[PDB]
């Protein structure tokens, strides 16, 4: 006896992660994200002096 | 008796990331990517002199 087999086959896989994390000095770091950019206004486009 | 077999195989695999990660002062570094490309014009196209 003769005796033939095929054995089509397929996988898949969507993982994901969404790890947030939390440090303490993150904030200090986060001060001034808008102060270097509003004072950049009165460096180049303000008369700065009286 | 006598027997014999042929087990022709193969595979594929196609993996893909897409990992993106938010570092806090990345935004610090990304404050200037313009500006220095732009007073590059300054210093050498224009008469920095009054």
């Given at each position: 006896?003769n005796?033939?087999?095929?054995?089509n086959?397929?996988g898949?896989a969507?993982?994901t992660?969404?790890?947030?994390q939390?440090?303490?000095?993150?904030?200090?770091k986060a001060?001034?994200?808008?102060?270097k950019i509003?004072?950049?206004f009165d460096?180049?486009?303000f008369?700065?002096?009286?």
């Amino acid at each position: 006896q003769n005796a033939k087999r095929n054995q089509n086959q397929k996988g898949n896989a969507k993982g994901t992660q969404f790890t947030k994390q939390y440090l303490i000095d993150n904030i200090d770091k986060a001060y001034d994200l808008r102060k270097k950019i509003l004072n950049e206004f009165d460096k180049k486009c303000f008369l700065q002096i009286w």
